[PDB]
RNA sequence: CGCGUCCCCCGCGAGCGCACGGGGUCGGCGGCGAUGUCGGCUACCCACCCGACCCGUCUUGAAACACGGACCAAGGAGUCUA
RNA sequence: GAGUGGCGCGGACGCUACGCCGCGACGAGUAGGAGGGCCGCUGCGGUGAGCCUUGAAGCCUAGGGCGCGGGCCCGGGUGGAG
């Protein structure tokens, strides 16, 4: 369970990276990238993750499915969104609110997605 | 221009000089590194007028401005590009400082990756 | 509908009404004043019509934000500030300009402008100073006055007129308004004797002169 | 009630 | 044309006897020799004008060698007409017994 | 909240007293013309 | 339905408003009563002294009930009996102040910490000045500023002291619940005397500024408040 | 500049269990909420007893 | 400052606005700008004012006409078992 | 509190709970006692898909900074294998 296998990995995990009075976690589905019970991408049943696409353009929204959770090859559903900035974020807000899938991660997922799109956008 | 921080409060410091060790002036054996004097007659220890100052917790900096660089950012120390995507979302308050023993060919990858991610580097044009 | 009558009770001292709330009930006559009990505008398009929204959502969110402030009360913007005159600054009083390029020059005060800056004119025929603005705390109001009771200062010269647009060249408007106003002040200074030469002279501190004794 |  | 500042002799520092406080400076303005003669100078601006080796930009024209530390008269000090002032950085102690300028232009007349 | 009432009454009472004292001085000025 | 729900919440809010206005009116009318009580208190002693002098007899008035005690000397080199009495009065710091009501018990406690305190009989003005400017309550053992009346009303509601004018009345006219109103007030952290002292060490009678300063304590209250 | 003895300024009771036992630590998490958010005194007694050493929470016989 | 009603004497009106109101804001301005100037507290050198006796140790009491210490680097002293 | 009768698809930050936040009083100190060290040294089990001949340790430095401090991190030089 969540609170159980938090008390194991809160201080003694591979991903934990302590220096300069700052604590991050390099987890494959952490968004805001920090040591927390909320944003940890391994603990929970429900998990949302935003990555840059396999190619240059687009993002990839990763949804951890309810059913089989000791089943890591089939545990994650990946979808790509290569649209305009507003229509990319609107799709994410409609995936997270209108499924009632981690509504506390809605705003953090839109901020991360926006940062990924602003990153893959050329410099003058 | 520069990559400006999210807030610029004016970083007030209670003291600017170091706390030099007692009788570090005279002896080359005595380092400048601080050591609390525990001698039974020591002037510095029993706080005589116009001697070397001893550190207290009173000198402690504001919790808002603590570890904050003159610019307004806070440092994070980075060895490879896998340790930047950590800072991606901590962007406006935190900045990367690429370590001493990272090779030239890896600095030219970290700064050309941090330029894309819009993360500040404090030592961007080191070796070249 | 109803014409708003200005405050029925006067002000005795700041924050304090003249009349109490029993007097005031009768004063307003409330014994015969008793009472009982957008977003998406549509647009026609050349396969149907569309629903646009003025104020539609942002495309970019920044990675970190600042929250909203708390609420304070007495923090007004500069346009709405109450403007003081120092009592000695009477329209027609001969000031002594202290700070800028024209420091030590004695100059006739015309009127307090809308932003608290003194509109001031040492006649350009005498002092070589135009229709210029000054600050109250950078002058000395002397006990020297001439009667400016009648003459009409142009109204179009105000705090927006004197603002630096962004070498500087004197407009013909400025020169007409200068000789327009000064043609009405020159006969008033040339009335009282030795006064034009007094304005032409420059204020200075000598040996044995302490300002704490001199009445000026 | 005595306001009415 | 002529002078537009009263002449204040920088007497020394705000102090007890065996403990001086350099943040406040004691001014002796010439002519004023009482506490009922120094109401005029309270709040006025003070300048320690000096000149040093290198060129430093001037507000109003050419880069000169001249420099300033702006102050401000705060209080009257003692019974016989001396004045406390406070400067943007502490005055140098080489200035003791040297001229500083009492201005007129936070003017109250 | 009674402070407002006391202050208003005090200012009005002082004003009336000053007016009466000024009138008495005016009566003295009348007597000194007489 | 919700039309009913918000109507009920609006009613309960309006009920809370009219309860506020009713209490507020009680604060106004009690302050008007206390004003009338103080003026007739003041007039009476002038009347009684006049009718005494008209007959040719004397009017010895009431020996005062209320004292204001200021600690003038510090923490260093102090006797244990003088220590215990000073911390029983709650004068644990130089230039701390408390009101103590005079009886037989308290006067014989005052005269044994005599050289460490400067005390006397306060004025109505001084009692107003001290409790309005330096008024802090001992609410949850925490020194909290009396900015509102909902501190005094919530703490001293049981004794019918619901405002600042009630507090000042119960202190000045030494009433029933002086103990629970004086112990509510955190000891008054006064400034240094502006104008200086005469002499700290000796008695008031022999030039100094220690011991009983009968009506002259109000002057010391002005310079330290 | 005030005469207080600071001997007894700190209080020497437990605010947390010394044990790094996670199951005990989740029970303490669970009963800190109930001690705070109920006017029950039972939850305050049980929470306090969850902190105490083995020599202070002894074995009750059947 | 409604009467429709409870004494001995003679329970939801409506707005708008100003603010001595649970901690500062401006819907105010003005200069100077590419090898000669702007900023850089800390840090190198120097000057001036104030303060300022040399550490360690035993001692009631150490700057002591009390003892140890010319200077520098590396080693160097509450450990393990019952 | 609850029942039966009389258009527009929107809403900042948060909560390493061993965390974050709010309010009040306080702060000398030898011998001595306790706590916290993201103070430092050397080796072992884990771990960083760590760093490194495109230059590791070490050393020097009027360079840039952080920390109340123990200390530490970058820049330049030397050095050549950790």
Swiss-Prot record, chain A:
Compartment annotation: Cytoplasm
Q: Where is this cross-link: Glycyl lysine isopeptide (Lys-Gly) (interchain with G-Cter in SUMO2)?
A: 57, 64
Question: What superkingdom does the record give?
Answer: Eukaryota
Q: Which residues carry this modification: Phosphoserine?
A: 114
**Cellular component terms per the entry's GO annotation:** cytoplasm; ribonucleoprotein complex; ribosome
Q: Name one GO biological process term.
A: translation
Query: Which Gene3D superfamilies does UniProt cross-reference here?
Result: 3.30.390.110
Q: Which InterPro entries match?
A: Ribosomal_eL28, Ribosomal_eL28/Mak16
Which family does the similarity line name? Belongs to the eukaryotic ribosomal protein eL28 family.
Q: Which named protein is this?
A: Large ribosomal subunit protein eL28
From Swiss-Prot, chain B:
What cellular component GO annotations does this protein have?
cytosolic large ribosomal subunit
- Is Protein biosynthesis among the key words of this record? no
* Record-listed cross-link Glycyl lysine isopeptide (Lys-Gly) (interchain with G-Cter in SUMO2), residues: 8
Q: Which CDD domains does this entry report, sorted A to Z? A: Ribosomal_L32_L32e
One Pfam annotation reads: Ribosomal_L32e
PANTHER family reported for this sequence: 60S RIBOSOMAL PROTEIN L32 AND DNA-DIRECTED RNA POLYMERASE II, SUBUNIT N, RIBOSOMAL PROTEIN L32
| Biological function | Component of the large ribosomal subunit. The ribosome is a large ribonucleoprotein complex responsible for the synthesis of proteins in the cell.
Q: What is the recorded name of this protein?
A: Large ribosomal subunit protein eL32
Q: Which organism is it from?
A: Oryctolagus cuniculus
Lineage, opening ranks: Eukaryota, Metazoa, Chordata, Craniata, Vertebrata
From Swiss-Prot, chain C:
Q: What biological-process GO terms show up in the record?
A: cytoplasmic translation; ribosomal large subunit assembly
- The PTM Phosphoserine maps to 72
Quote a single Gene Ontology cellular component term.
rough endoplasmic reticulum
Q: Which GO terms describe its molecular function?
A: RNA binding; structural constituent of ribosome
Indicate where this protein resides in the cell: Cytoplasm, Cytosol; Cytoplasm; Rough endoplasmic reticulum
**CDD domains per record:** KOW_RPL6
Per UniProt, which keywords does this protein have? Acetylation, Cytoplasm, Endoplasmic reticulum, Isopeptide bond, Phosphoprotein, Ribonucleoprotein, Ribosomal protein, Ubl conjugation
The cross-references to Pfam families, in alphabetical order and at most eight, read: Ribosomal_L6e (PF01159), Ribosomal_L6e_N (PF03868)
Carrying N6-succinyllysine, the residues are 43, 152
Q: Which residues carry this modification: N6-acetyllysine?
A: 167
Record bears the keyword Iron:
no
Where it mainly occurs, coarsely classed, is cytoplasm
Name the domain of life this protein comes from.
Answer: Eukaryota
What does the annotation say about its assembly with partners?
A: Component of the large ribosomal subunit. May bind IPO9 with low affinity.
- Family per UniProt? Belongs to the eukaryotic ribosomal protein eL6 family.
Question: Main role?
Answer: Component of the large ribosomal subunit. The ribosome is a large ribonucleoprotein complex responsible for the synthesis of proteins in the cell.
What is the protein name stated in its UniProt record? Large ribosomal subunit protein eL6
Gene encoding it? RPL6
UniProtKB/Swiss-Prot annotation, chain F:
Localization per record:
Cytoplasm
Q: Report which superkingdom the organism of origin falls in.
A: Eukaryota
Q: Which residues carry this modification: N6-acetyllysine?
A: 4, 32
Its post-translational modification remark reads: Citrullinated by PADI4.
Instruction: Give the modified residues of type Phosphoserine.
Output: 33
Tell me the residues linked by Glycyl lysine isopeptide (Lys-Gly) (interchain with G-Cter in SUMO1). Answer: 32
* Quaternary data: Component of the large ribosomal subunit. May bind IPO9 with low affinity. Interacts with RBM3.
**Role description:** Component of the large ribosomal subunit. The ribosome is a large ribonucleoprotein complex responsible for the synthesis of proteins in the cell.
Query: Into which family does the record put it?
Result: Belongs to the universal ribosomal protein uL4 family.
What is the designated name of this protein? Large ribosomal subunit protein uL4
Tell me the part of the parent protein that is shown: 330 to 363 of 413
